[PDB]
Amino acid sequence: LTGVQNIDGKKYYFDEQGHRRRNYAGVFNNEFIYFGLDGVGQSAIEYQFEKGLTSQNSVATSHNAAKSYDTKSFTNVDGFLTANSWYRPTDILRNGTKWEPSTETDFRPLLMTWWPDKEVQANYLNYMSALGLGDQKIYTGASSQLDLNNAALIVQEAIEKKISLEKSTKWLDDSIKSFIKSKRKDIQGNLVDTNPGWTIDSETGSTNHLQNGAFIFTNSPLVPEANAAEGNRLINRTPSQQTGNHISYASQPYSGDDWGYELLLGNDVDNSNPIVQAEQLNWIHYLMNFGTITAPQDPDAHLANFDSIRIDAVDNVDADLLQIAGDYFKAAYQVGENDKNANQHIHILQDWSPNDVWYNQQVNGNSQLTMDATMQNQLLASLTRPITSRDSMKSFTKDALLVHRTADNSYNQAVPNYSFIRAHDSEVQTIIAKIISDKHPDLYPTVDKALLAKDSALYDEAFTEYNADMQKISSQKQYTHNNMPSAYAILLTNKDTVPRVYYGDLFTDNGEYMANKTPYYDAITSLLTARTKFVSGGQSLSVDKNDVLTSVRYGKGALSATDNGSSDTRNQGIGVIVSNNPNLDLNNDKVTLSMGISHAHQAYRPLLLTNSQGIVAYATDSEVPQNLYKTTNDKGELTFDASEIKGYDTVQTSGYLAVWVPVGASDEQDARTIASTEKNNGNSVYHSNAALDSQLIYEGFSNFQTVPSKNASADEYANVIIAKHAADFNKWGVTSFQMAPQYRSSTDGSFLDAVDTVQNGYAFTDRYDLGFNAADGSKNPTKYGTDEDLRNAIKSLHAQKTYDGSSIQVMADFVPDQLYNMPLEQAVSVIRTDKYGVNSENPDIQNIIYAANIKSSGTDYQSIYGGKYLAELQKNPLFKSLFDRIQISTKKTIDPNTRITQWSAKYFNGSNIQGKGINYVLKDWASNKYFNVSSNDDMYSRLPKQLMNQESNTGFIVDDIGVKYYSISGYQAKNTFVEDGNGEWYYFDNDGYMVKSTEESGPLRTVNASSKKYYILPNGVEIRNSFGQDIQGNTYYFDARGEMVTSQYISDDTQNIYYFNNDG
């Protein structure tokens, strides 16, 4: 059978293929039929909407009309209304039994007396009915307007009685907010959001962001105060892309890739805005003078200042900031003059992209130290990986390493760098999340998915496993790093690098600060003090035929194996042996430590050695038994037998580790070198040399440190423990103490940093608040301590003095990228995007108005200190070059003339998706304009006419000329689409009349001079997800938006494909 058929008094269409069709329109045997989803024909002549209007004027609309139309009587966001708007009516139905004038505090939720369409009204009624206040009747969007209105009166009676009983409306804010986010069962049987336009479910777009979605803020004439200047909101200005275009600075062996992207986390700060760039400078000046600024009455306030900064998230922010900072330290502390001044202020980059190393060198001029990621990645791959996945030791002599150490024999050649093995983030968090995954596949089956979980009970569980696996032998380490002391032994003996030690190597990553040691503490703290006494001179790496790494330092004064050295050489210069093979069987093969010829016929003793029991550590010459002493031959070589070196499997080593030092060193002996005072002509601020290698960084925190409970004793707080243990860090050779960010944390759980169990300080609302006491004067700390406790930690570290007589530096975590959890809402124009700022191309969310949490309180410490010192600094001659500098990305100078005391949306690139819902800002569907109460401009819609006690009618009205529609608010449809409760779409033209196709002008129609073609029946029904037949017999398809498809193949329900060409 083909064509039109009556099967059981019902019309069906069978195509020319014989297939029964659904969602097909056409003129068949001179009759216009629409085969709906059923596959059943409906008459495309007969109107499908209930004809008629109902007045929204009631006996009660005179009373429930707003007393004042002005902002006073409406809660609002910059004049706009949201679903959580409350308003003051003229009268209150007090206790459900009398109309009384409203007082100044008699506000009620807008949603008690007005809804944006009938379906929301229906759902509200059934929900308030679930709480016992509403009627049993179960009204739907299908039920009549008049019934819904009367039911809202019965609900209102019940609300008012409850309010009179409580003498409070707080319970109603609670219940309406819960209604707005409510879920319900459906026909499918799955839970769905009741009100999708008011939840994250409507915020659909790209998932490529840490928080599953992003907005870019853009300008729009509806919102004057959130609009940025022209040439601001620059995106993705990484060091590689700072100019506007990617630039590889890398040469033949090395990569010049960029892994950056602007929108990382939170609310994204526009660091391309010159006023923001000035406020970033002001914040650095505040940190570098924190003591003198916060405790002016303390005579020692000048000892409680920070000395250096680490730049955080370098790949995510405008790279102009690196120059701004590098200028400040030249202006303030003359770091450009010589190594002596440079090395007193050691800054570091979190520069993960391979190109950044070379950007830093060529453009940056080394104002901050790059990380050696090639060293980190190689130490991990060759030793820490379990046996299956492990690289050969021979990889340490490869070409792709940043600093070749096989033949390093000179100063001022290597790129100045810091190298490390682990970070608060790097190689800690990922391991925990994998444990969560391997224990709970039901919640997070893929490893990446496990990262994101915030449950306190999930971390506690994952950590008892993590801690237990760290105690296991290397062959049974399922998650923890193997060979950790072997890695630290290479790192701490290497030349031309500033090593950084992670807190969580020495201590447990979780629990009380400094309270529990790792299995590695003895090995690593031995190496740290030994570095101070022996590690100096040139270096060489080798690997013998058995893959045994031998790293040698020749001692101060000697730069190669054939160098005779100075008087300092003899008792300096360590040698290290590492194997990564648990079954190493040397047999007849010999391992050789070739110390220098400067070290011929010389007694050596062990610092570290591997047993089956673990690693033995000898702290002095006299702790070594005399048979373990070994003397070098005439060439300066030590030789080892299978009786000494074999494969091991302990907690601390897969393979072998040994460290040998020359006998007879004094206790006065320090291997470190004083910084040069000679003037530096070079582009770089730092130089890789003996004085710089004398430095060492200690990352003094972990994410998963337990957070001192509300009534914690004074000595749980980490900054107090730091002050106690100040001498221990100096003993370890620490010259730069990298503290945690000290900023008051968010507790909201938008991210892992924002979790109340681990409030690390990277998630903050008020950058200037380092734990100042509360308003009442009660002590109110951060995770680490009060402002007092911080100032005292800084003084204790400053009181410690290193080998050159200078203080131990204290480093601030400089975090310019984002702000979290801002208190006030602002209207903003948004586009849905991914993390790169690429338009996710959602039609519904293009330049729409959103109520974003994006405005600071204006009573915070930002409001006190923000831009405060820019007036002072501009007047200082030393800072002239900073303020006159043309920045790379902006091509303008910094703008210190405006102060930022309240953050506003105009200073942000964008934000993560906040889950308010697209239609959270309220809007009349007929006029398609937003409500605004602060303005009577024509771009905004006036209040719904009922609320201003005017005549108001809603529904469809047939007329001698055509069909008009009025919304629930009482306004006429003009130049919009309108969905009926039946599910059908219609369109209304400029004249305010429904578009209907005619015999003379067929169903395929452009409507809005938009070049977009739709299919409209004689009903006025605009068909969607459907096929449309022409009078000529041509067939077109119309997508989910109703738009005609062109040059494209459409797939069908039954897997049938039709490919429609351009225009037809």
Ligand X SMILES: OC[C@H]1O[C@H](OC[C@H]2O[C@H](OC[C@H]3O[C@H](OC[C@H]4O[C@H](O)[C@H](O)[C@@H](O)[C@@H]4O)[C@H](O)[C@@H](O)[C@@H]3O)[C@H](O)[C@@H](O)[C@@H]2O)[C@H](O)[C@@H](O)[C@@H]1O
C-beta of 284 vs 815, nearer to ligand X = 815
* Residue 975 assigned to a binding site: no
Query: Distance between CA atoms of 82 and 92, rounded to whole angstroms?
Result: 22
C-beta of 717 vs 762, nearer to ligand X = 762
Residue 313 interacting entry, from Ca ion, ligand X, none, C-beta within 5 to 8 Å by type? ligand X
Query: Distance between CA atoms of 306 and 291, rounded to whole angstroms?
Result: 8
Interacting span for ligand X (CB under 6 A) from 9-17, 18-26, 313-321, 637-645: 313-321
Cβ 934 vs Cβ 76: under 8 Å: yes
Q: Name every residue whose Cβ is closer than 8 Å to that of residue 518 and which is 6 or more positions away in sequence.
A: 470, 484, 504, 505, 506, 507, 508
Least distance CB 657 / ligand X (angstroms): 25
**Gyration radius of the chain's alpha carbons:** 36
C-beta of 788 vs 817, nearer to ligand X = 817
**463 lies in the binding site for ligand X (CB under 6 A):** no
Cβ 265 vs Cβ 757: under 8 Å: no
CB-nearest residue to ligand X: 425
Cβ 529 vs Cβ 521: under 8 Å: no
Least distance CB 116 / ligand X (angstroms): 38
Cβ-based neighbour number of residue 441 at 10 Å: 11
Q: What are phi and psi of 640, to 5 degrees?
A: -120, 145
Least distance CB 599 / ligand X (angstroms): 38
Query: Distance between CA atoms of 511 and 521, rounded to whole angstroms?
Result: 16
Residue 268 interacting entry, from Ca ion, ligand X, none, C-beta within 5 to 8 Å by type? Ca ion
* Residue 316 assigned to a binding site: yes
Residue 762 interacting entry, from ligand X, Ca ion, none, C-beta within 5 to 8 Å by type? ligand X
**425 lies in the binding site for ligand X (CB under 6 A):** yes
Interacting span for ligand X (CB under 6 A) from 311-319, 392-400, 776-784, 919-927: 311-319
Residue 327 interacting entry, from Ca ion, ligand X, none, C-beta within 5 to 8 Å by type? none
C-beta of 270 vs 787, nearer to Ca ion = 270
* DSSP output for 238-294: -TTTTTSS------TTS-------S--SSEEE-TTSHHHHHHHHHHHHHHTTHHHHH
Residue 312 interacting entry, from ligand X, Ca ion, none, C-beta within 5 to 8 Å by type? ligand X
C-beta of 268 vs 505, nearer to Ca ion = 268
Least distance CB 231 / Ca ion (angstroms): 17
Contact pick of 3, 142, 168, 259 for ligand X (by CB under 6 A): 259
Q: How many CA atoms lie within 13 A of 581 on its CB side?
A: 13
Pairing of strands 417-420, 370-371: parallel
**298 lies in the binding site for ligand X (CB under 6 A):** no
* Type and span of the H or E element at 55: strand 52-55
Residue 317 interacting entry, from Ca ion, ligand X, none, C-beta within 5 to 8 Å by type? Ca ion
Task: Measure the N-to-C terminal CA separation of the chain; round to a whole number of Å.
Answer: 27
Contact pick of 315, 318, 356, 496 for ligand X (by CB under 6 A): 315
Contact pick of 203, 320, 670, 753 for ligand X (by CB under 6 A): 753
Cβ 771 vs Cβ 786: under 8 Å: yes
C-beta of 640 vs 751, nearer to ligand X = 751
Q: Name every residue whose Cβ is closer than 8 Å to that of residue 1055 and which is 6 or more positions away in sequence.
A: none
* Residue 262 assigned to a binding site: yes
**980 lies in the binding site for ligand X (CB under 6 A):** no
**344 lies in the binding site for ligand X (CB under 6 A):** no
Q: How far is CA 265 from CA 134, 691, 838, in A?
A: 42, 38, 16
C-beta of 697 vs 815, nearer to ligand X = 815
C-beta of 117 vs 425, nearer to Ca ion = 425
Cβ 867 vs Cβ 278: under 8 Å: yes
Least distance CB 417 / ligand X (angstroms): 16
Number of residues in contact with ligand X under rule CB under 6 A: 15
Query: Distance between CA atoms of 556 and 537, rounded to whole angstroms?
Result: 4
Residue 280 interacting entry, from Ca ion, ligand X, none, C-beta within 5 to 8 Å by type? none
**316 lies in the binding site for ligand X (CB under 6 A):** yes
Residues 758-817 that bind ligand X (CB under 6 A): 762, 815, 817
C-beta of 689 vs 889, nearer to ligand X = 889
Residue 259 interacting entry, from ligand X, Ca ion, none, C-beta within 5 to 8 Å by type? ligand X
C-beta of 319 vs 943, nearer to Ca ion = 319
- Per the DSSP assignment, residues forming a β-bridge with 809 are 736
Q: How far is CA 996 from CA 32, 1016, 1019, 1027, in A?
A: 13, 6, 6, 18
Residue 576 interacting entry, from Ca ion, ligand X, none, C-beta within 5 to 8 Å by type? none
Residue 927 interacting entry, from Ca ion, ligand X, none, C-beta within 5 to 8 Å by type? none
3-state helix, strand, coil in the chain (%, to 5): 25, 20, 55
C-beta of 156 vs 705, nearer to ligand X = 705
Cβ-based neighbour number of residue 1051 at 10 Å: 10
Q: The tokens of 160 are what?
A: 């008012």
Least distance CB 580 / ligand X (angstroms): 21
Contact pick of 66, 163, 276, 313 for ligand X (by CB under 6 A): 313
Pairing of strands 498-502, 697-699: parallel
Interacting span for ligand X (CB under 6 A) from 173-181, 309-317, 620-628, 927-935: 309-317
Least distance CB 500 / Ca ion (angstroms): 24
Taking residues 806 to 845 in sequence order and writing x for each that binds ligand X by CB under 6 A, - otherwise, the string is: ---------x-x----------------------------
Query: Distance between CA atoms of 80 and 848, rounded to whole angstroms?
Result: 13
Between CA 173 and CA 95, with CA 76 as vertex, the angle to 5 degrees is 40
CA 6 from centroid of its chain's CA atoms: 61
* Residue 817 assigned to a binding site: yes
C-beta of 755 vs 1004, nearer to ligand X = 755
Residue 425 interacting entry, from ligand X, Ca ion, none, C-beta within 5 to 8 Å by type? ligand X
**268 lies in the binding site for ligand X (CB under 6 A):** no
C-beta of 116 vs 239, nearer to ligand X = 239
Helix/strand/coil (H/E/C) assignment for every residue in 323-358 = HHHHHHHHHHHCCCCCHHHHCCCCCEECCCCCCHHH
**208 lies in the binding site for ligand X (CB under 6 A):** no
Q: Name every residue whose Cβ is closer than 8 Å to that of residue 936 and which is 6 or more positions away in sequence.
A: 942
Which residues make up the interface to Ca ion (CB under 5 A)?
262, 268, 316-317, 817
Query: Distance between CA atoms of 282 and 867, rounded to whole angstroms?
Result: 6
**352 lies in the binding site for ligand X (CB under 6 A):** yes
Interacting span for ligand X (CB under 6 A) from 308-316, 498-506, 588-596, 944-952: 308-316
C-beta of 108 vs 422, nearer to ligand X = 422
Interacting span for ligand X (CB under 6 A) from 2-10, 310-318, 563-571, 917-925: 310-318
Cβ 826 vs Cβ 226: under 8 Å: yes
Residues 365-386 as b/e (b if ≥16 CB within 10 A, e otherwise) read: bbbbbbbbbbbbebbbebbbbb
Interacting span for ligand X (CB under 6 A) from 56-64, 125-133, 258-266, 452-460: 258-266
List alpha helices for 764-910, DSSP H.
Answer: 787-799, 861-865, 870-875, 880-884
Which parts are annotated binding residues for Ca(2+)?
262, 268, 316, 817
Binding site for ligand X (CB under 6 A): 259, 264-265, 312-313, 315-316, 350, 352, 425-426, 753, 762, 815, 817
Annotated binding site: 262, 268, 316, 817
